[PDB]
CSV table of C-alpha atoms in Angstrom, one decimal:
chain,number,residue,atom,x,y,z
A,1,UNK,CA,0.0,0.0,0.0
A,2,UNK,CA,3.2,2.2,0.5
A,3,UNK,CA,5.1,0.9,-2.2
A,4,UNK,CA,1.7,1.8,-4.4
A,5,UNK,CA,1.5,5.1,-3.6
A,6,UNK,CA,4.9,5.6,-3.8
A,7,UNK,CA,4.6,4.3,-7.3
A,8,UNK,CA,1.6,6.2,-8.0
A,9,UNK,CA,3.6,9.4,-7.2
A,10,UNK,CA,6.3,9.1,-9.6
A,11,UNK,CA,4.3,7.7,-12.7
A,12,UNK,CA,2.0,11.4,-12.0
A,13,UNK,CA,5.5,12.7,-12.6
A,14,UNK,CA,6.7,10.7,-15.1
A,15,UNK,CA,4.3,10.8,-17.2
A,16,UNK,CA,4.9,14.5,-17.5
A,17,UNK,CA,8.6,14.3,-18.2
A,18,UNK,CA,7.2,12.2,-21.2
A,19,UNK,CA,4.9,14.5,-22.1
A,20,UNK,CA,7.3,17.2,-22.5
A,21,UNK,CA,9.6,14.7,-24.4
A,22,UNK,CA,7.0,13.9,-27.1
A,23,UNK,CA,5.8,18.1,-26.9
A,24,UNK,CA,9.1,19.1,-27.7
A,25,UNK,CA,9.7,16.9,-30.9
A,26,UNK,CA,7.5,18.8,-33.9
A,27,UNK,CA,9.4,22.0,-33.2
A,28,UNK,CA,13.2,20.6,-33.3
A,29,UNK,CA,11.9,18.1,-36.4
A,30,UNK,CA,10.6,20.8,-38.3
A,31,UNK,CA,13.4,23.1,-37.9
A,32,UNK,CA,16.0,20.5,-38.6
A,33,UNK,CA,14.1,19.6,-41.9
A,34,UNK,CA,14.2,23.3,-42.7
A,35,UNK,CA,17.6,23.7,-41.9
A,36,UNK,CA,18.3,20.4,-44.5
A,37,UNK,CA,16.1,22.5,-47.1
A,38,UNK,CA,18.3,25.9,-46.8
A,39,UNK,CA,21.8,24.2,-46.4
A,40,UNK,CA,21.7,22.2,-49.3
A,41,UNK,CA,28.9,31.0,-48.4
A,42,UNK,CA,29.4,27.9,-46.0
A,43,UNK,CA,27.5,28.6,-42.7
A,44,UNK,CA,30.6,28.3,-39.5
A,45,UNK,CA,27.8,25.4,-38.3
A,46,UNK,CA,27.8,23.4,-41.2
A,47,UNK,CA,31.6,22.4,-41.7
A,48,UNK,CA,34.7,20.9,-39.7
A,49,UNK,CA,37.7,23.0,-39.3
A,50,UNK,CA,40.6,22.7,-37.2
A,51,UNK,CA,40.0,21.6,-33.2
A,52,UNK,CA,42.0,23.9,-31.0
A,53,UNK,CA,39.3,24.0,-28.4
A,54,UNK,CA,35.8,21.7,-27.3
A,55,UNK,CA,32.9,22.7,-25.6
A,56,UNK,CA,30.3,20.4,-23.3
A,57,UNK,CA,26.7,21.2,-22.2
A,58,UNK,CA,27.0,18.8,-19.7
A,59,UNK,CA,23.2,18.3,-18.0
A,60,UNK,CA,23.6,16.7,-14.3
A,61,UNK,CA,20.4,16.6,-11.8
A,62,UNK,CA,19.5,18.5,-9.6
A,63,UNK,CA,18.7,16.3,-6.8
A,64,UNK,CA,20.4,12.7,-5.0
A,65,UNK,CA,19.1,10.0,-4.3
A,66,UNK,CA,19.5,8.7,-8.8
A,67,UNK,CA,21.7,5.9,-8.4
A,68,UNK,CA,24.6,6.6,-10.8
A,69,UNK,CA,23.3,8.5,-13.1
A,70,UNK,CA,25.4,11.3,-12.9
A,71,UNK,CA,28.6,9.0,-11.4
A,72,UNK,CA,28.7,7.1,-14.7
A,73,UNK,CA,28.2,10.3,-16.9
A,74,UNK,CA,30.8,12.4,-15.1
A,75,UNK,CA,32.7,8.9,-16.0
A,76,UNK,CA,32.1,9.0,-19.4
A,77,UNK,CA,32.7,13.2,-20.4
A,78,UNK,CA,36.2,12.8,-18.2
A,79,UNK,CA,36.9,9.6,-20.4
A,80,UNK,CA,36.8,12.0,-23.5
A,81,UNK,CA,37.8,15.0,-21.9
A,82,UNK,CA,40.9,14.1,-21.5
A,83,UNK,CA,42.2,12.3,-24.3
A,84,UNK,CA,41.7,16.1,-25.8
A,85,UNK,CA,43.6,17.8,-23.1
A,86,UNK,CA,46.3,15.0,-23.7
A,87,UNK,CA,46.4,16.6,-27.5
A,88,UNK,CA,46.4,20.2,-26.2
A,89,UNK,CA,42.7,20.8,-26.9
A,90,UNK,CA,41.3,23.2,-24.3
A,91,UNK,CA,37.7,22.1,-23.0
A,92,UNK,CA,35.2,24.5,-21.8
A,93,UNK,CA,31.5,23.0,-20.2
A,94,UNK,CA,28.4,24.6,-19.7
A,95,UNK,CA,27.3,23.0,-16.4
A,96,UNK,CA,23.6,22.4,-16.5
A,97,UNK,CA,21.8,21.5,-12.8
A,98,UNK,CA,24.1,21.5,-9.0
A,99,UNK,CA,25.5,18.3,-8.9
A,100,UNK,CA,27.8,18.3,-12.0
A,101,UNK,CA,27.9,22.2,-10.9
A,102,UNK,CA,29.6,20.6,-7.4
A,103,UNK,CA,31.2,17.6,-8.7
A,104,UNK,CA,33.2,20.1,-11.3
A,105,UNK,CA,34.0,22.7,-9.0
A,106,UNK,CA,35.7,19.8,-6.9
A,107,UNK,CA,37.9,17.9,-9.7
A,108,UNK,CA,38.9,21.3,-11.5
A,109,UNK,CA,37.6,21.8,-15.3
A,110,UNK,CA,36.5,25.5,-16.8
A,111,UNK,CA,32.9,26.0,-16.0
A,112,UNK,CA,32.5,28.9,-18.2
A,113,UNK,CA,28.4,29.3,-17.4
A,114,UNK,CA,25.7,27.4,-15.5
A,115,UNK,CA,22.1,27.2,-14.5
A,116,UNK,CA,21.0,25.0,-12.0
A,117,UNK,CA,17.9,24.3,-9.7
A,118,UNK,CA,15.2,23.9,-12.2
A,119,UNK,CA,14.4,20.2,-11.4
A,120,UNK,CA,10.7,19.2,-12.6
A,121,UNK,CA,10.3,22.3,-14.3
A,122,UNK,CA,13.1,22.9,-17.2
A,123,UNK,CA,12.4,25.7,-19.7
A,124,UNK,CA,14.2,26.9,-22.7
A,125,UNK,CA,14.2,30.3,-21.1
A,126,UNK,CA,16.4,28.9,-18.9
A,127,UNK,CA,19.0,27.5,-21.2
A,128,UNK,CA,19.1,30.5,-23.1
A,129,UNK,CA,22.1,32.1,-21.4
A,130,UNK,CA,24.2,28.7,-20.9
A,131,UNK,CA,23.8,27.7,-24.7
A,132,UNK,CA,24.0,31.3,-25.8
A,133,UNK,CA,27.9,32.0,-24.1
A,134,UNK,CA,28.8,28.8,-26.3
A,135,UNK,CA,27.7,29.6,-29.4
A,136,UNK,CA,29.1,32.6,-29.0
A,137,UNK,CA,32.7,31.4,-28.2
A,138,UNK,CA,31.8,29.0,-31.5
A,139,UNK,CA,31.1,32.1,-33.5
A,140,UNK,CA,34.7,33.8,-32.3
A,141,UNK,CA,36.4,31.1,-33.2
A,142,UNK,CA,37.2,30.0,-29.5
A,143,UNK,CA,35.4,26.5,-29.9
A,144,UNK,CA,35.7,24.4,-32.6
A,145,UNK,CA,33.2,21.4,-31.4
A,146,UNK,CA,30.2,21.5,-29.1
A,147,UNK,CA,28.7,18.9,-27.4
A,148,UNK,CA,25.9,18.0,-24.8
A,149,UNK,CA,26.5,15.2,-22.7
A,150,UNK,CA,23.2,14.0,-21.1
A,151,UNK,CA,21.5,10.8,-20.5
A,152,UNK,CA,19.2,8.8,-23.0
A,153,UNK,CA,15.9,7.9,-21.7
A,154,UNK,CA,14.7,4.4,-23.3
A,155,UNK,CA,12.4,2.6,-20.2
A,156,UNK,CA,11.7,2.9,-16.4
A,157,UNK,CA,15.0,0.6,-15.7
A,158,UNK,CA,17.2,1.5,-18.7
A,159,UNK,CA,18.9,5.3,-19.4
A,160,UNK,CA,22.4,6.0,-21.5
A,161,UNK,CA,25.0,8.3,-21.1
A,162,UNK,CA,25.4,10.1,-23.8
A,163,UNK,CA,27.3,12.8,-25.9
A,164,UNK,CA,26.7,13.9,-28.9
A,165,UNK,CA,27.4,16.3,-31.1
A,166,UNK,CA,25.6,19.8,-31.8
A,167,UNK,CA,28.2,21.6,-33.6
A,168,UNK,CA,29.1,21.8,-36.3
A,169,UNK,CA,26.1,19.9,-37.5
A,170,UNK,CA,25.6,15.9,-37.7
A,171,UNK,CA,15.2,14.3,-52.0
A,172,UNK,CA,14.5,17.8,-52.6
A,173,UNK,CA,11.7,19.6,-53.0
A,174,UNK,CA,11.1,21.5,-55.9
A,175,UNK,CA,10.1,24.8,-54.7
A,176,UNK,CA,11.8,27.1,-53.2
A,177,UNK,CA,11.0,29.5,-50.6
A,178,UNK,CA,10.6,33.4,-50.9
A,179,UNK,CA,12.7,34.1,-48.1
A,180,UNK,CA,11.8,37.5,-46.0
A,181,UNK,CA,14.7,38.7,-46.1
A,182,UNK,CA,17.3,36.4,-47.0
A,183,UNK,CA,18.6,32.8,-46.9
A,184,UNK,CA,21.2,33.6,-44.8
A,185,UNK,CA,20.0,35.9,-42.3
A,186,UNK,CA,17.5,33.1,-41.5
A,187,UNK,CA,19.8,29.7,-41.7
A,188,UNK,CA,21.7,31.2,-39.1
A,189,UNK,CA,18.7,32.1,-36.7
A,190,UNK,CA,17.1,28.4,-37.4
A,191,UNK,CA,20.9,27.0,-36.7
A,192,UNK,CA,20.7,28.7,-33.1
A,193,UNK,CA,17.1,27.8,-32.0
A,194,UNK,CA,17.8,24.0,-33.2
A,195,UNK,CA,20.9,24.3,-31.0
A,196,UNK,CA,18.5,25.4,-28.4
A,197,UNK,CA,15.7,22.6,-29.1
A,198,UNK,CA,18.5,19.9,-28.6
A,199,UNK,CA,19.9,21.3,-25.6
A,200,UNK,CA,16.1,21.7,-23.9
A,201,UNK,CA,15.2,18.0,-25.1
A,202,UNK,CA,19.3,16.9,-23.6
A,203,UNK,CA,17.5,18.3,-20.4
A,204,UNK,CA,14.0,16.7,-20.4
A,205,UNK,CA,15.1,13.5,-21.0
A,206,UNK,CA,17.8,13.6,-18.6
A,207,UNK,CA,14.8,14.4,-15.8
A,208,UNK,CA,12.7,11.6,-17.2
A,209,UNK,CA,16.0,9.7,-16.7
A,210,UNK,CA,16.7,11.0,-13.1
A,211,UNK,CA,13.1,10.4,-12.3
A,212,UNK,CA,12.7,7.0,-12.9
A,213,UNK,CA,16.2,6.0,-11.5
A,214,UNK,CA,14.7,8.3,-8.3
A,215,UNK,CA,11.6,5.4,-8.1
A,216,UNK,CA,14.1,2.8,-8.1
A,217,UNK,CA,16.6,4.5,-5.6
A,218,UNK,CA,13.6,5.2,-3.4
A,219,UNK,CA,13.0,1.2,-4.7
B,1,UNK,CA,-8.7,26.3,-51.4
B,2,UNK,CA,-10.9,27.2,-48.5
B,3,UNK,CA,-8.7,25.3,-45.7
B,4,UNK,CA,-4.9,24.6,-45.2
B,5,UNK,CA,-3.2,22.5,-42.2
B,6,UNK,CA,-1.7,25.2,-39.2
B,7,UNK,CA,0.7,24.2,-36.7
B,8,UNK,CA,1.7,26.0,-34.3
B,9,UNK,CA,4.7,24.8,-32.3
B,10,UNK,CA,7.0,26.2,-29.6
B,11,UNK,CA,10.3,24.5,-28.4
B,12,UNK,CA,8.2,23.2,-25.2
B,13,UNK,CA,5.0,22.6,-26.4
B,14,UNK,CA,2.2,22.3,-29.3
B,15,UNK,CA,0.0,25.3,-29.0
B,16,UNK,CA,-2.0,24.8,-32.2
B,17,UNK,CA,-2.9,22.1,-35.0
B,18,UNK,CA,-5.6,22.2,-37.2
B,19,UNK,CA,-7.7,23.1,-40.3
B,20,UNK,CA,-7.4,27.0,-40.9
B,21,UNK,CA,-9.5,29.1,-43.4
B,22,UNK,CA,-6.5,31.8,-42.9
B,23,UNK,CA,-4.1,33.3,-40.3
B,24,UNK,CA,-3.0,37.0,-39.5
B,25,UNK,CA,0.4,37.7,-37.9
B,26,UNK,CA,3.4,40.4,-38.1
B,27,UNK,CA,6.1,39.1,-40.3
B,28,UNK,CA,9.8,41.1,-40.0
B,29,UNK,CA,9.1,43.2,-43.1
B,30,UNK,CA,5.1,43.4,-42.7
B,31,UNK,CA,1.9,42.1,-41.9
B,32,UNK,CA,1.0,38.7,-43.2
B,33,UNK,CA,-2.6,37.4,-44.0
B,34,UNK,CA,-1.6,33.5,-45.0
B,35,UNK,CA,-4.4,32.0,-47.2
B,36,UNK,CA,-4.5,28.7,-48.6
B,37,UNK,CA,-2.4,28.9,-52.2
B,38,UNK,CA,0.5,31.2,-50.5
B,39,UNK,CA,3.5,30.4,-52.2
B,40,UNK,CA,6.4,28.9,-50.2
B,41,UNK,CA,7.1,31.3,-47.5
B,42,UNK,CA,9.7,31.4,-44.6
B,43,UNK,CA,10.3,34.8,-42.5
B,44,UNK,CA,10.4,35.6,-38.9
B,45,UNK,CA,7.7,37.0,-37.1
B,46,UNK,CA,7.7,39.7,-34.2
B,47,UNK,CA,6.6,39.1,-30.7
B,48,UNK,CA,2.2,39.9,-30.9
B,49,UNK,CA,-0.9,38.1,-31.2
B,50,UNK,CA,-1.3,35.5,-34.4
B,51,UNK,CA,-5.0,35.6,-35.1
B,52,UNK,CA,-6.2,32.1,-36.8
B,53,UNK,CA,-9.6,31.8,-38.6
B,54,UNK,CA,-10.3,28.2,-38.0
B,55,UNK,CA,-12.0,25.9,-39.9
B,56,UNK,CA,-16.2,26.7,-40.1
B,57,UNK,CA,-15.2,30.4,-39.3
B,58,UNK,CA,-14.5,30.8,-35.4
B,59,UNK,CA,-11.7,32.8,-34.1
B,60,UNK,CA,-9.0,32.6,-32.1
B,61,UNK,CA,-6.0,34.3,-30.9
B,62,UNK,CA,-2.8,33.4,-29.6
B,63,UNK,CA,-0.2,35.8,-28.2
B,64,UNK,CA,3.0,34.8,-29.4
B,65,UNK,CA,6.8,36.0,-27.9
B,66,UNK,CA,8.0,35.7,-31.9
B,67,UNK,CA,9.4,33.3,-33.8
B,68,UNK,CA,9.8,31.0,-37.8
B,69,UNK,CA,6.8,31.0,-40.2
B,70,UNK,CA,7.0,28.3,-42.3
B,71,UNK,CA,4.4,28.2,-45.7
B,72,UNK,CA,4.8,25.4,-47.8
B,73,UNK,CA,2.9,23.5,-50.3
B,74,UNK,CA,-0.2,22.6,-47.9
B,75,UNK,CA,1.1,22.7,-44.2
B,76,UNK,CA,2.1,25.9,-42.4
B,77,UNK,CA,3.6,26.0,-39.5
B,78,UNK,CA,4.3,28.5,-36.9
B,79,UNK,CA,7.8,27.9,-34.8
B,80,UNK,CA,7.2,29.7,-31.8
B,81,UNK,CA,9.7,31.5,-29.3
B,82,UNK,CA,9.3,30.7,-25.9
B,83,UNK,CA,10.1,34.3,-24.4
B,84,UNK,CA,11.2,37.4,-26.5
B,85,UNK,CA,14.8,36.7,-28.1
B,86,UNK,CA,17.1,39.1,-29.1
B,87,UNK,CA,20.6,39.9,-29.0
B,88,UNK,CA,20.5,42.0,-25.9
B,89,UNK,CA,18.0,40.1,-24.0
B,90,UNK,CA,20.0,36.9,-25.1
B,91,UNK,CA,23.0,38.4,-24.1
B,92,UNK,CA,21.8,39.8,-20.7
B,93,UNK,CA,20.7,35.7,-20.3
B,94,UNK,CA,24.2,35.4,-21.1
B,95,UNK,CA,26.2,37.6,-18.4
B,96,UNK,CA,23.7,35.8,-15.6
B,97,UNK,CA,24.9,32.3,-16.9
B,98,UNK,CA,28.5,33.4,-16.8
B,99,UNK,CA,28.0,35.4,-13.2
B,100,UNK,CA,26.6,32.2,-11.6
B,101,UNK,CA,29.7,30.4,-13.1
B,102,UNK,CA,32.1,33.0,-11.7
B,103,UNK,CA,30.9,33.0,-8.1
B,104,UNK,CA,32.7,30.1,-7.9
B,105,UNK,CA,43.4,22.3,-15.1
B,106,UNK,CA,40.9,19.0,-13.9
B,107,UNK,CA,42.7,16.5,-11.6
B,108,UNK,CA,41.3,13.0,-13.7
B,109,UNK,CA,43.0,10.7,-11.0
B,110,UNK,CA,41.4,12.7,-8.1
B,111,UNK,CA,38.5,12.7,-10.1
B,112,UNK,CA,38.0,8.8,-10.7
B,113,UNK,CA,39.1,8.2,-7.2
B,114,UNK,CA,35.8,10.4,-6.1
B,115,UNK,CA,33.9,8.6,-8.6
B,116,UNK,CA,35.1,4.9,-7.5
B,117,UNK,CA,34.1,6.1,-3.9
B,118,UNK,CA,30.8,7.3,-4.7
B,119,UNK,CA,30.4,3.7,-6.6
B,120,UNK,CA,31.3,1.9,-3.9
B,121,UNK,CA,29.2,3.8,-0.9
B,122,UNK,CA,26.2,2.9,-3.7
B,123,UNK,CA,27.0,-0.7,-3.8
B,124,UNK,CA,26.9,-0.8,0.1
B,125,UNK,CA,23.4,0.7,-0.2
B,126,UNK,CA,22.3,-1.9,-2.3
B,127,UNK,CA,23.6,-4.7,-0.1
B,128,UNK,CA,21.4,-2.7,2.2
């Protein structure tokens, strides 16, 4: 009768992480098959240049009591971390909730931004800032490589560490757009906001991740 | 004619989907009546109120922070902002994310140590 409730609770809240997962698809699908539409002057985004410098958005929870889901994607990002550092390839992360926030600030690494304490509630408005200070350090030439490290929701008793790669960026119609007012101008702001979309949907999945793990810590 | 498929979509959510006899809503360059037959379109819109003429004639509005229109052949689709964007205000986002950072190079073998604890002190939980 305890163990119910207690199961009752966190399906209420799961089923809203999922919610948000399957809301948040439409927009970054769209945009991503816009983007294929206008990219096929070489957009910074679209190419591979030389890596002198890599950035993580690295999304941690919030709150204990998760197992190891953070412990075994801390693992993972150091793994990869360093075999750049070994080459002399800076790394700068965007730490995303307070654990990684205090884990980082503990074993050293270049926590250039953060936002933390949004738990059940993530928003894009929050990740504004965080994603916006590494783009911007893409744009100057001071990253060559972005990445958001976060963990793969798949069932209530399986979740994967993951990073992947934002930037630069991983059968035709024809028509053409009239494009208000130009190709370019635009590319560029739909290259950003799907940045954005995968960030924010890094995020909610990593809560439906830490939520679940949370029903089976609290077993 | 008469109807074309509207979606409206922000990075959070899907505020709108459905048959539309035609939408209003300020574009960058001007304002934009989208009927069915526009030609391909894509322009961004400013932060306002989109008004949509549903299907069988009732109204509706929708105030939206900005954002992507999207008209192609059929489907349009609306790609919302969540909260006005702009190179200041994204920037002022910005400075808050860096402050937080700044209030306060990476030892990997004191780091795996601390991870190797915390694995261990989980593996005592689980044998209770």
């Amino acid at each position: 009768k305890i163990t119910k409730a207690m199961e009752m609770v966190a399906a209420s809240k799961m089923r809203k992480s999922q919610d948000r997962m399957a809301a948040s698809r439409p927009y970054a699908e769209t945009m991503r098959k816009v983007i294929g539409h206008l990219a096929h002057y070489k957009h910074p985004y679209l190419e591979d240049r030389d890596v002198k410098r890599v950035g993580y958005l690295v999304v941690s929870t919030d709150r204990g009591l998760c197992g190891g889901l953070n412990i075994n994607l801390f693992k993972k990002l150091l793994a990869e971390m360093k075999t750049w550092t070994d080459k002399g390839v800076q790394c700068d992360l965007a730490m995303i909730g307070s654990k990684g926030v205090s884990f980082f600030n503990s074993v050293g690494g270049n926590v250039v931004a953060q936002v933390t304490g949004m738990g059940d509630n993530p928003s894009l408005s929050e990740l504004i800032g965080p994603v916006k200070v590494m783009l911007q350090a893409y744009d100057e030439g001071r990253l060559d490589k972005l990445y958001i490290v976060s963990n793969k929701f798949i069932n209530t008793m399986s979740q994967v560490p993951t990073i992947s790669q934002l930037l630069p960026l991983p059968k035709h119609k024809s028509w053409d757009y009239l494009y208000e007012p130009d190709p370019k101008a635009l590319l560029d702001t739909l290259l950003r906001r799907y940045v954005e979309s995968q960030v924010y949907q890094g995020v909610v999945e990593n809560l439906a991740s830490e939520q679940a793990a949370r029903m089976v810590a609290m077993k | 004619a008469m109807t074309y498929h509207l979606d409206v979509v922000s990075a959070e959510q899907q505020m709108f989907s459905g048959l539309v006899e035609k939408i209003q809503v300020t574009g960058s360059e001007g304002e934009l009546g989208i009927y069915p037959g526009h030609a391909p379109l894509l322009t961004a819109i400013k932060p306002g109120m989109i008004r949509i003429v549903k299907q069988h004639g009732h109204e509706e509005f929708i105030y939206l922070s900005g954002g992507i229109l999207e008209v192609q052949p059929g489907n349009v689709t609306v790609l919302a902002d969540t909260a006005i964007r702009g190179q200041d205000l994204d920037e002022a986002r910005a400075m808050e994310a860096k402050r937080k950072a700044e209030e306060h190079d990476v030892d990997y073998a004191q780091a795996s140590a601390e991870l190797a604890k915390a694995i261990a002190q989980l593996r005592v939980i689980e044998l209770t």
